[PDB]
């Protein structure tokens with residue numbers, strides 16, 4: 001609910017901007033924005049507010065966190081981004097993975113998520129099992145996002161909009177296919193596909209369905225389905241809170 005951002009060195013700021021450009025060109029070229037967003041998201045979602053452990057602090061680099069079940073396939077993102085670290089080694093992995101999320105969203109047409117650099121790489125990855133269970137429901141979402149992460153009900157619907165990008169893969173999570181007809185375009189189509197019900201060739205996890213069966217989550221999804229500026233605004237807000245969990249507080 002309050003931040004005090006470090007002023008990083010001119011050289012770090014220059015690294016960040018150089019990296020941002022390189023991420024644009026890497027991402028746009030290899031069309032892997034969605035997996036990049038997933039890396040940022042999974043790097044940050046592990047934060048627990050009561051224990052002040054986990055969160056966007058580079059730990060996704062430790063091949064132990066890449067071995068967490070929930071994280072199958074992030075090792076591809078981590079290897080894809082290493083050249084970027086090779087050229088700007090002063091950057092932390094913490095910063096580099098969140099900047100990739102931000103750049104993913106912006107390249108695919110989505111809102112401008114501000115970026116405040118300065119995350120340190122911590123040494124101890126969080127414990128496995130903090131991220132949300134795709135087969136679970138509305139109250140689980142509040143346990144993960146709400147009680148552990150400290151985000152709000154609005155953050156949950158808006159953020160669940162990240163599934164406007166990309167798809168599931170059988171070898172990673174078990175589920176298969178995309179949520180939307182245009183998986184390389186950041187728009188509000190995800191909430192439109194939800195409210196439309198199940199259909200062939202499009203995925204819907206039970207955690208997706210949870211948003212339609214809840215009096216708070218339901219109208220938010222309706223709003224975002226109808227109003228893409230509303231969605232882009234709230235998403236921008238939530239993505240930014242997500243990207244700084246435990247970072248630069250007070």
Ligand code: HEM
Nearest residue numbers: 034035037041132134159162165166167168169172173207
């Ligand atoms: C309850 C919350 C969530 C659940 C249960 C969940 C679960 C999943 C699952 C099972 C996949 C498919 C993985 C695979 O086999 O490739 C996936 C993909 C993805 N998730 Fe979520 N996720 C959640 C929240 C989020 C959030 C908050 C974001 C971003 C802000 C996000 C971004 C993505 C993206 C971009 C992909 C596509 C990856 C690709 O195309 O390779 N997810 N998610």
Ligand code: NA
Nearest residue numbers: 164180182185
């Ligand atoms: Na889309």
